[PDB]
Amino acid sequence: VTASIDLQSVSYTDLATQLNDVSDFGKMIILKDNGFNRQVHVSMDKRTKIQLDNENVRLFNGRDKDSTNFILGDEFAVLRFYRNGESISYIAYKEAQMMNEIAEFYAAPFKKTRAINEKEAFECIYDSRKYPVSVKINVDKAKKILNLPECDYINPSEPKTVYVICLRENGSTVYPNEVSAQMQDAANSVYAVHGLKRYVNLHFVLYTTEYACPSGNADEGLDGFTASLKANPKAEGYDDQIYFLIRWGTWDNNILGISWLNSYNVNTASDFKASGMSTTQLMYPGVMAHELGHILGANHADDPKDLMYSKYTGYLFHLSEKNMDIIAKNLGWEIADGD
Amino acid sequence: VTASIDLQSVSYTDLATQLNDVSDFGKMIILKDNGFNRQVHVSMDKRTKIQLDNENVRLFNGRDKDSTNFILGDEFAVLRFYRNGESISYIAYKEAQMMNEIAEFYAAPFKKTRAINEKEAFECIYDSRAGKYPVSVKINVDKAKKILNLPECDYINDYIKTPQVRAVPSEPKTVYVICLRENGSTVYPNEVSAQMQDAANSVYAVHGLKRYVNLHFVLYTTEYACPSGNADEGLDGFTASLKANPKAEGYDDQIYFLIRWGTWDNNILGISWLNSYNVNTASDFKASGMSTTQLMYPGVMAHELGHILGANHADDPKDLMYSKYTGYLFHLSEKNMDIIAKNLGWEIADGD
Ligand SMILES: COc1cc(=O)n(C)c2c(OC[C@@H](O)C(C)(C)O)cccc12
Ligand SMILES: COc1cc(=O)n(C)c2c(OC[C@@H](O)C(C)(C)O)cccc12
Ligand code: PRO
Ligand code: PRO
Ligand SMILES: [Zn+2]
Ligand SMILES: [Zn+2]
Ligand SMILES: [Zn+2]
Ligand SMILES: [Zn+2]
């Protein structure tokens, strides 16, 4: 009698019908696979707004104990949950030609070195009687199979609408599911701290820019990105918003992203100071969240399970009490307000 | 500095960026033209859900005194307001090739019969900030039907019958209005979602029915096509097709519609089984009908949804359920409102 999603044949239509059924009161959906089940209570994420090149993308969350998240756009749908501490994404594109391009893209690195457990890290999901309907990627198993070299860092009455204006770097190709996952992880990292949804509602937008980094250097790239915003007339009057140059790859010495530390404050934001750069590749979730953290004043953390750890860890939440205080204050929150 | 929309150059991006910024608290937008101004307070319609072939379409309403409505999908955006009693729509498609096809489609009948004040009934809006292709089209439906001299259609015998025919819920019931594009038919997204928006709003306007139901419209293609121009024979086959369709098994308790762009024999705008829905007795795909989706006849799907919910032909020419096509979109008949609200689980004790 309960609704369910079969991960052995999950398509865009499967996720789209289920997620489009979720009312304001939430919906119970059972995630089904071979040797797997999970009843989740899905609800619409009504805090975050997303447009990718003017295309509305919706977010859905399960309960805290479900570790499940969803992304639903008109052309793609994503299911991301945690199973034995590993992140598993099911990415389904609506158009047959696009799903094949996406499946080819995600399958290519494994085609070089055949894996002992390829099906556990990456698998093409097929229709129940050929073209794939979705792809399954266990990020944690994939990074172990691919032997990927290390990428890292160095060094109110109504909530306020803050725009996170993402700009696809000139010459870059970013993938919709990949970009909106970095965005979903960024907003959720923020709303998890001190009940910040009462203070801010993040609106992510994505456009293309004529600006491209003049070299592989990330410091020179961000300096140039900030300077390009100040000279861009399409950004005149938006100097008080958050900005990100997004690309698929990384910068020199495998830098995942960069940003100006403590560059945003709901009352002092100006001169496009609150800007950064980020990769959007699926194998490194939480990079945009980590940079959005630095932009909101968060410092490098001592806990290896913290999002703001000095090194890249795959964790997506702020665990540091000092960082949570700094971030929430920058968004207008005070200790007297509570959580 | 309030936000505003210039109707002298309104594009998809213009409507999309404005409607996409509307928060849960609503937004004040000024509609600007050559001297005309209207401040409207837009808010998202959170009662109705719409997917057209799995593409999400959102609705926005102004205040009651604004007479303004919006439709926002990924590929098109619509603004529909009233000015001096006439219904004006601004239809903007996102893709250049699609906007040009749409502009050509809407302009074509006006080239056959060239009017002096064509600009009043129909106009291609161009990029003033400059441009070469249209960014949207303006259609004053009431002036267009007068210019085109469209042969009138009426709901004369638009219903058939069958010889068989508690408390306010914690959450209103989700009722799906499953629309199926007839085989061989081409329906236009803006046109279809306008018939749907007018159908849901006709329902929520009666006895505070949003507390009892939340309508969810979906659109798919069906292999069924009417075997003749007859509407009674068409609806009989449509209902039968549903019973023999396995993709509809377990959904016999929902509302159904065969949709097309044109009309049936003797210019019938649509048809449906009278008093075919009830939140507690709905079954066997009884609550089904057929409807045109052409822009020049707004309210046909609402009129048929009315018939499905038990509404009879009204006597007031300003009523939605009047037997002749009038262009009004609301039930004014006290008896029809009682019949419709009762079928959706409402009682006099509950109030409005
Ligand atoms: C090249 O960059 C941009 C490209 C582009 O198309 N636009 C419009 C930009 C932009 O618009 C304001 C936008 O966020 C609002 C608040 C209206 O929703 C802001 C910042 C940059 C751009
Ligand atoms: C031609 O008939 C149909 C064609 C078609 O593609 N489908 C899937 C239909 C259908 O889907 C269930 C739908 O309402 C839910 C509840 C999932 O949103 C229901 C009824 C009919 C169809
Ligand atoms: O996922 C879907 O809905 C369809 C079928 C396979 C490719 N596109
Ligand atoms: O809408 C899009 O996704 C295309 C791809 C590059 C930028 N514009
Ligand atoms: Zn860092
Ligand atoms: Zn981990
Ligand atoms: Zn995690
Ligand atoms: Zn009638």
PDB file of C-alpha atoms and ligand atoms in Angstrom, chain A residues 17, chain B residues 176 178 180 218 220-222 245 247-248 251 256, ligand 2:
ATOM      1  CA  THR A  17       6.199  10.808 -10.244  1.00  0.00           C
TER       2      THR A  17
ATOM      3  CA  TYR B 176      -5.610  13.860  -9.621  1.00  0.00           C
ATOM      4  CA  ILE B 178      -5.417  13.021 -15.322  1.00  0.00           C
ATOM      5  CA  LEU B 180      -4.697  12.636 -21.799  1.00  0.00           C
ATOM      6  CA  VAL B 218      -0.979  15.495 -15.002  1.00  0.00           C
ATOM      7  CA  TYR B 220       0.200  12.185 -20.852  1.00  0.00           C
ATOM      8  CA  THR B 221      -0.421  10.984 -24.394  1.00  0.00           C
ATOM      9  CA  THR B 222      -3.046   8.303 -24.933  1.00  0.00           C
ATOM     10  CA  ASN B 245      -5.784   0.401 -20.138  1.00  0.00           C
ATOM     11  CA  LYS B 247      -1.373   1.990 -17.179  1.00  0.00           C
ATOM     12  CA  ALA B 248      -4.579   3.339 -15.435  1.00  0.00           C
ATOM     13  CA  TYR B 251      -6.497   4.839 -10.620  1.00  0.00           C
ATOM     14  CA  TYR B 256      -9.986  12.077 -16.308  1.00  0.00           C
TER      15      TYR B 256
HETATM   16  C1  LIG C   2      -3.133   6.595 -20.935  1.00  0.00           C
HETATM   17  O1  LIG C   2      -3.191   6.470 -19.490  1.00  0.00           O
HETATM   18  C2  LIG C   2      -2.067   6.764 -18.773  1.00  0.00           C
HETATM   19  C3  LIG C   2      -0.825   6.959 -19.271  1.00  0.00           C
HETATM   20  C4  LIG C   2       0.315   7.118 -18.429  1.00  0.00           C
HETATM   21  O2  LIG C   2       1.456   7.352 -18.837  1.00  0.00           O
HETATM   22  N1  LIG C   2       0.086   6.942 -17.053  1.00  0.00           N
HETATM   23  C5  LIG C   2       1.255   6.635 -16.232  1.00  0.00           C
HETATM   24  C6  LIG C   2      -1.221   6.983 -16.471  1.00  0.00           C
HETATM   25  C7  LIG C   2      -1.444   7.123 -15.091  1.00  0.00           C
HETATM   26  O3  LIG C   2      -0.332   7.369 -14.317  1.00  0.00           O
HETATM   27  C8  LIG C   2      -0.424   7.366 -12.882  1.00  0.00           C
HETATM   28  C9  LIG C   2      -0.277   8.840 -12.391  1.00  0.00           C
HETATM   29  O4  LIG C   2      -1.585   9.421 -12.398  1.00  0.00           O
HETATM   30  C10 LIG C   2       0.476   9.123 -11.075  1.00  0.00           C
HETATM   31  C11 LIG C   2      -0.381   8.881  -9.841  1.00  0.00           C
HETATM   32  C12 LIG C   2       1.776   8.339 -10.984  1.00  0.00           C
HETATM   33  O5  LIG C   2       0.846  10.513 -11.077  1.00  0.00           O
HETATM   34  C13 LIG C   2      -2.734   7.058 -14.582  1.00  0.00           C
HETATM   35  C14 LIG C   2      -3.804   6.867 -15.437  1.00  0.00           C
HETATM   36  C15 LIG C   2      -3.603   6.737 -16.800  1.00  0.00           C
HETATM   37  C16 LIG C   2      -2.317   6.800 -17.337  1.00  0.00           C
END
